[PDB]
Design a protein around this ligand. Structure first.
Ligand SMILES: C[As](C)(=O)[O-]
Ligand SMILES: [Ca+2]
Length: 273
């Protein structure tokens, strides 16, 4: 809840000399470490600011990756986040772990609502908005409790088509991108896959017809076939379609998405009990 300054020496002790590399992150590599109090951290090292730290200091929401501290020493720019032990939504949908454990519909729903709330907090931020501009399943991280934490708010298949007119990314561009994420969550497919039959190359182009023709069962992840209530799935698919409208003007705000995703989870929780 409060940002700390670390020394390079401390980051090296925690990181065991960058022994582990958690993965490619936005604006630098990210290594795994443990602080001397025992909490697991991810340490982002800028490849190549104090205003950014103040912005990141000002962002506080349960569905955003929080900043623990930073390192300023010797013209280095290091950022320290909690380690998210359950990894990325992308990985749990069609990653290696998806072959072991199938993420169930209610959990998928709960992760989407979490992520939407995080983005909603950023979009409606007092004074000026915070726009992510690179929303994707790999940037929706999961903690021990499978609570969504959106990352890299400091990609082909997700890019707002309208960007080719405006050459600008906006809240509405984040909304389009999120719509593609909702399609991943429903379908269990990555947006772009050349190895798929030609008609299935684009998840977005492939899906719209079936949704438009009210035949959602065809596009649903086999692992959650008969694992959802139709009323709840309709809501998610419907709002997903509005998000991926080629023209931002017809696209809902993130907060309309929050409400639809809340409605879907109340429908499932109601039928579950
Ligand atoms: C990027 As801001 C905290 O001025 O809305
Ligand atoms: Ca608000």
């Amino acid at each position: 809840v409060s940002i700390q300054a670390f020394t390079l020496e401390y980051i090296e002790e925690a990181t065991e000399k960058y022994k582990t590399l958690i993965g490619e992150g936005g604006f630098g590599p990210v290594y795994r470490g443990m602080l001397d109090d025992g909490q697991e951290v991810a340490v982002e090292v800028r490849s190549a600011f104090d205003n950014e730290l103040n912005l990141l200091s000002a962002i506080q929401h349960e569905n955003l990756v929080p900043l623990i501290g930073y390192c300023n020493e010797k013209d280095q720019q290091i950022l320290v986040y909690p380690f998210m032990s359950n990894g990325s939504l992308q990985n749990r949908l069609y990653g290696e772990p998806a072959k072991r454990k199938i993420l169930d519909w209610p959990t998928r729903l709960s992760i989407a609502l979490g992520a939407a709330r995080g983005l909603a907090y950023l979009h409606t931020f007092p004074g000026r908005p915070v726009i992510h501009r690179d929303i994707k399943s790999s940037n929706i991280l999961l903690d021990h409790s499978m609570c969504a934490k959106v990352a890299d708010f400091g990609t082909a298949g997700y890019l707002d088509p309208e960007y080719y007119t405006t050459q600008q990314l906006s809240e509405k561009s984040d909304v389009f991108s999120f719509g593609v994420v909702l399609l991943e969550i429903v379908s269990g497919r990555e947006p772009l896959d050349i190895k798929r039959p030609r008609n299935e190359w684009s998840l977005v182009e492939w899906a719209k017809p079936y949704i438009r023709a009210s035949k959602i069962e065809e596009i649903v992840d086999p692992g959650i076939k008969g694992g959802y209530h139709a009323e709840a799935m309709w809501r998610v698919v419907e709002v997903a379609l509005q998000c991926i409208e080629p023209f931002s003007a017809y696209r809902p705000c993130m907060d309309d998405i929050v409400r639809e995703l809340e409605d879907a989870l109340i429908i499932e929780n109601n039928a579950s009990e």
